[PDB]
Design a protein around this ligand. Structure first.
Ligand SMILES: [Ca+2]
Ligand SMILES: [Ca+2]
Ligand SMILES: [Ca+2]
Ligand SMILES: [Ca+2]
Ligand SMILES: [Ca+2]
Ligand SMILES: [Ca+2]
Ligand SMILES: [Ca+2]
Ligand SMILES: [Ca+2]
Ligand SMILES: [Ca+2]
Ligand SMILES: [Ca+2]
Ligand SMILES: [Ca+2]
Ligand SMILES: [Ca+2]
Ligand SMILES: [Ca+2]
Ligand SMILES: [Ca+2]
Ligand SMILES: [Ca+2]
Ligand SMILES: [Ca+2]
Ligand SMILES: [Ca+2]
Ligand SMILES: [Ca+2]
Ligand SMILES: [Ca+2]
Ligand SMILES: [Ca+2]
Ligand SMILES: [Ca+2]
Ligand SMILES: [Ca+2]
Ligand SMILES: [Ca+2]
Ligand SMILES: [Ca+2]
Ligand SMILES: [Ca+2]
Length: 415
């Protein structure tokens, strides 16, 4: 008889595992054959998934044969048999045996993209800066450290899946302002070298500006004029604010004589704020600015503007009293009758029709300034007989409503 040797089979591929790519092509199965009657040229036979493969032992005790990966994927064990002869021509089979494993599939998982910024809207501030785009990746062969790729506005951003299945990557807001749809692809692999991609989709919106409205300012006081009395107290400056993104509670800011005043737009599109007359007396124009924001948090100022007029003084004139009777003496027949006491009132804001008031002997006489700047009033002679000194006071006002008194004095004698 002939004598068997030793046959061995090397790993099936470098890791002894058949993956997808290997299973799809051809695999060199190799090994050794020596000892006994094994000689160069002895045929090596392998049956693998029912297919008979054959090669011959080379000159160094080695053999190799190309096997279809599909047969190795289907059959995880096989003998390799070398057939030999001794010189006498007895025959003998030497067997070596092989095992391997098969894994021809990686498993995708699940990938998601979170809202793009807290509100899934890119605003103006966000477009101008850096936004962190985040999400999840979990399931199947997705593991910590797998690559995440996002293409956004033609820019390729990458990160890696963290230990918790989340991922984040800093992205330019510009890019997000310009491209409102994209995918995150996560690429995973298994021990065997199989690879798989898992995709998640994201959309968002862009809104970079908030819309101004219309702001108006009412008259400054009833007549749009600041008088002295008004300048000395407080004035309610009011108006309206509506349209665009203006809403109740939006701040209204007015600067007037360098003082900053603020209130808030009420529920009816109206506003009001107490301003010191003195600032209004000092500064005859101002803007009222309402600061608003849209849903996305863009902000906008709406301006309305005010003018007004200022007049805080009346001007006193000149008042005189004529001689009391032609000779400036009250006689007995004058005392017994009525005397016309007369004079002038002119200058400043004194005007035709201004009130003239005389108190003589406790009795109050009044008349008005005529067209010529003179005045006269009939007075009891007895009163002039009883009181030899008195004032005439003329009360005048201006258009703004300031008022002034002008006084002239008189004395006379009695006989
Ligand atoms: Ca023999
Ligand atoms: Ca392999
Ligand atoms: Ca068979
Ligand atoms: Ca050969
Ligand atoms: Ca088998
Ligand atoms: Ca066997
Ligand atoms: Ca032989
Ligand atoms: Ca093996
Ligand atoms: Ca697998
Ligand atoms: Ca946002
Ligand atoms: Ca890309
Ligand atoms: Ca896109
Ligand atoms: Ca892996
Ligand atoms: Ca979204
Ligand atoms: Ca907007
Ligand atoms: Ca006024
Ligand atoms: Ca001003
Ligand atoms: Ca302005
Ligand atoms: Ca708002
Ligand atoms: Ca005005
Ligand atoms: Ca005046
Ligand atoms: Ca007289
Ligand atoms: Ca008197
Ligand atoms: Ca007047
Ligand atoms: Ca006199």
């Amino acid at each position: 008889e002939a004598t068997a040797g030793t046959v061995t089979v090397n790993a099936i591929t470098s890791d002894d595992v058949i993956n997808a790519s290997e299973a799809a092509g051809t695999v060199a199965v190799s090994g050794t054959a020596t000892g006994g009657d094994i000689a160069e040229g002895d045929t090596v036979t392998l049956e693998i998934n029912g297919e008979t493969y054959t090669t011959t032992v080379d000159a160094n005790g080695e053999w190799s044969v190309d096997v279809a990966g599909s047969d190795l994927a289907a059959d995880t064990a096989f003998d390799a048999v070398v057939t030999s002869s001794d010189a006498a021509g007895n025959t003998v089979d030497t067997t070596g045996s092989s095992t391997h494993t098969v894994d021809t599939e990686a498993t995708a998982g699940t990938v998601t993209v979170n809202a793009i910024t807290s509100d899934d809207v890119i605003n103006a501030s966000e477009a101008a800066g850096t936004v962190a785009v985040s999400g999840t990746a979990t399931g199947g062969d997705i593991a910590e450290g797998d690559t995440v790729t996002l293409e956004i506005n033609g820019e390729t951003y990458t990160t890696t899946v963290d230990a918790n299945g989340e991922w984040s990557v800093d992205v330019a807001g510009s890019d997000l302002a310009a491209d409102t749809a994209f995918d995150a692809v996560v690429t995973s692999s298994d021990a065997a070298g199989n690879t798989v991609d898992t995709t998640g989709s994201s959309t968002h919106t862009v809104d970079t500006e908030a819309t101004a409205g219309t702001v108006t300012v009412n008259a400054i006081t009833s007549d749009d004029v600041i008088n002295a009395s008004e300048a000395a107290g407080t004035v309610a400056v009011s108006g309206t604010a509506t349209g665009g993104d203006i809403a109740e509670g939006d701040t209204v800011t007015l600067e007037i004589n360098g003082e900053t005043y603020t209130t808030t737009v009420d529920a009816n599109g109206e506003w009001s704020v107490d301003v010191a007359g003195s600032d209004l007396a000092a500064d005859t124009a101002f803007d009222a600015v309402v600061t608003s924001s849209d849903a996305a948090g863009n902000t906008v100022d709406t301006t309305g503007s005010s003018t007004h007029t200022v007049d805080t003084e009346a001007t006193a004139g000149t008042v005189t009293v004529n001689a009391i009777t032609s000779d400036d003496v009250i006689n007995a027949s004058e005392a017994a009758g009525t005397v016309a006491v007369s004079g002038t009132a002119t200058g400043g804001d004194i005007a035709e029709g201004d009130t003239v008031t005389l108190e003589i002997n406790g009795e109050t006489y009044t008349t008005t300034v005529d067209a010529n700047g003179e005045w006269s009033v009939d007075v009891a002679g007895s009163d002039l007989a009883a009181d030899t000194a008195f004032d005439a006071v003329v009360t005048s006002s201006d258009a703004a409503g300031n008022t002034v008194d002008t006084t002239g004095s008189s004395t006379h004698t009695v006989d």
